Symmetry: C2
Subunit: 235 residues, 2 copies
C-alpha cells in the first residue's frame, strides 16, 4: 500500500511498532536484498563504536539488507551511501546536513544522524538513525528542531529510500562516484583530532580514492585514516 | 515510521511492491500474531470461491495472521471480522457498504471488497481485498468510483487496521458480538439462490448463532447454509 517505485532498496519493507535493534534483526533474519527494516523505536540500538544510541518514537530508525557484488576494496564505501543519502534527503527539506567522516551527518556541528554498517560475508546491513521529531541527547539535533516544526516521518522515509536506491544502483555500476558526492558534502578544511591507538591532530584535507581521511599534521606529515575503530573529534 | 497504535493487529507489517499472494506468504511464513502482510499488487490473487481475484495497483491487498485462543466453534466467525472491519472503514469514508453473506461487501449491490480466510496449522490467515483506486472488473466498484476521486491508500490501510484490531480484541473476549454487527450490516429480507447440488432458493431471513444463513423456501421449509464453499446469488 506504500506504492514504492524503487528498483532494489524498498522492494520489501518490514515495519515494527517496536524492536530491539533493526540492525540485529536484519543481520539475523533470512531477508532478500533491498529489504528495509524500520521501527517506530528501538529499545537496544547501538552506534558504530558499539555505544548506546537513543531511538525514541519520532525518529527514523531503519536498516537495509544489501549484497553488493563489488570488489572487496569498495566495500568500505557502503557507509558513505548512507551518509550521502541522508544529506540529500535533508537538502530536500532545506536542512544543511554535512558529513563528519566517516559515518555522521551534522547540522551546525550537531549530530542529526548516524550510519552503521555491519556485514558477515556476503550480507551487508546498512543501518541509519535519523532524528526527525524525536527528543535528542545534548549536542545532537533533529529535523524538527532545525525547521522549528514537525516533519511528516513517512515523507522523510519515502525521500530517503528513493535517494538510497538511486545511489546504490549507481554504486554497483560506478563504485567511485560516491566519493565525489561525499567530498562535496563533507566537513573539511578544519582541525580535527584522531582518536585510535593514542591520537594525533591536524587538518582534515580530504578523502582519498579509498575513502580514507587525509590529515595534515602541523609537522607537515600526512596520515591516511582508514575507517574502523577510530574516533574523530573537531577542535 | 508508520506509528501504528494498535494492540495486536499491526504490531508488525510486511510490505511488498509485488507478491504472488499475501495469504500464501502468510500461510507459509513463521509470523507472530497480528502481523500484517500487504502488497501494492498480487500476481496470483484468488477468492473465497477460488476465482482469480484481480489485485492491480491502487487497491488494498492484505492478509493478517491470527491465532485466536477461542473455542473451536467460534473459529469460523473470523471472516465476519474482516467483513465488518471493511464496512466500518467504508462508513468512515462516507460509503455505505453492505455485507453479502458470508464474505463480501457491496455498495449498491456492486462488489467493493472480498474476504478470504484460510487456516494453515493452528494459525488463521485473514485475507482482505478492497478496491480503492484500482481499476475493477465490470459490475464491481471501488472507493474511488463511489467517491469520484482518488483516495489516500495509506489512509484506508490505517483505518481498516484500527477497526480490525478493535474488533479482534473484543472477539477474543466476547466472540458472539460480531454476529450482531454482521446482522445489522448484512443484506437480508431478499430472495437468494444457493448454487451447486441440491440447489434451492428462498428468502435470506437472518444468520443464526453459528453464522449460518437461514433461508425460508417457498414451501415453508427452513434450511441453514454453512459458510464453506457456498456459492450464492441474489434474485
Ligand atoms: N539520537 C541520537 N542522536 C544523536 N546522537 C546520539 C543519539 N543517541 C545517541 N547519540 C550519541 O551518538 C553516539 C552514537 O554512536 P557512536 O558513538 O558509535 O557514534 P560515532 O560517530 O562513531 O562517535 P561520536 O558520537 O563520538 O561522534 C553515542 O555514543 C551517543 O553519544
Ligand atoms: N478486485 C476485485 N473487485 C471486485 N470483484 C472482483 C475483484 N477481483 C475479482 N472479482 C470478481 O468477484 C468475484 C467474487 O468473489 P469470489 O471469486 O471469491 O467467488 P464468487 O462465487 O464469484 O463470490 P460472489 O457470490 O460473492 O460473487 C470473483 O469470482 C471475480 O469475478
Amino acid at each position: 500500500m506504500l506504492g514504492l517505485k524503487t528498483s532494489i532498496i524498498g522492494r520489501r519493507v518490514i515495519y515494527f511498532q517496536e524492536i530491539t535493534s533493526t540492525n540485529e534483526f536484519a543481520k539475523t533474519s533470512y531477508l532478500e536484498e533491498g529489504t528495509v527494516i524500520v521501527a517506530d523505536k528501538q529499545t537496544m540500538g547501538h552506534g558504530r563504536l558499539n555505544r548506546k544510541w537513543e531511538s525514541p518514537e519520532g525518529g527514523l530508525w531503519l536498516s537495509i539488507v544489501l549484497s553488493p557484488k563489488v570488489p572487496q576494496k569498495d566495500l568500505p564505501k557502503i557507509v558513505f551511501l548512507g551518509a550521502v543519502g541522508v544529506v540529500e534527503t535533508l537538502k530536500e527539506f532545506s536542512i544543511d546536513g554535512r558529513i563528519k567522516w566517516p559515518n555522521d551527518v551534522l547540522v551546525n556541528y550537531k549530530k542529526i544522524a548516524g550510519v552503521l554498517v555491519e556485514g558477515k560475508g556476503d550480507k551487508i546491513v546498512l543501518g541509519i538513525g535519523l532524528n526527525v521529531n524525536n527528543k535528542v541527547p545534548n549536542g545532537a539535533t533533529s529535523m524538527k528542531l532545525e525547521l522549528g516544526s514537525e516533519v511528516p516521518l513517512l515523507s522523510v522515509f519515502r525521500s530517503l529510500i528513493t535517494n538510497l536506491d538511486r545511489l546504490y544502483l549507481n554504486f554497483l555500476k560506478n563504485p567511485m562516484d560516491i566519493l565525489n558526492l561525499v567530498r562535496d558534502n563533507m566537513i573539511l578544511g578544519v582541525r580535527v583530532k584522531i582518536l585510535g591507538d593514542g591520537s594525533f591532530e591536524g587538518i582534515a584535507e580530504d578523502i582519498d580514492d579509498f575513502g580514507r581521511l587525509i590529515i595534515r599534521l602541523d609537522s607537515g606529515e600526512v596520515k591516511k585514516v582508514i575507517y574502523g575503530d577510530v574516533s574523530l573529534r573537531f577542535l
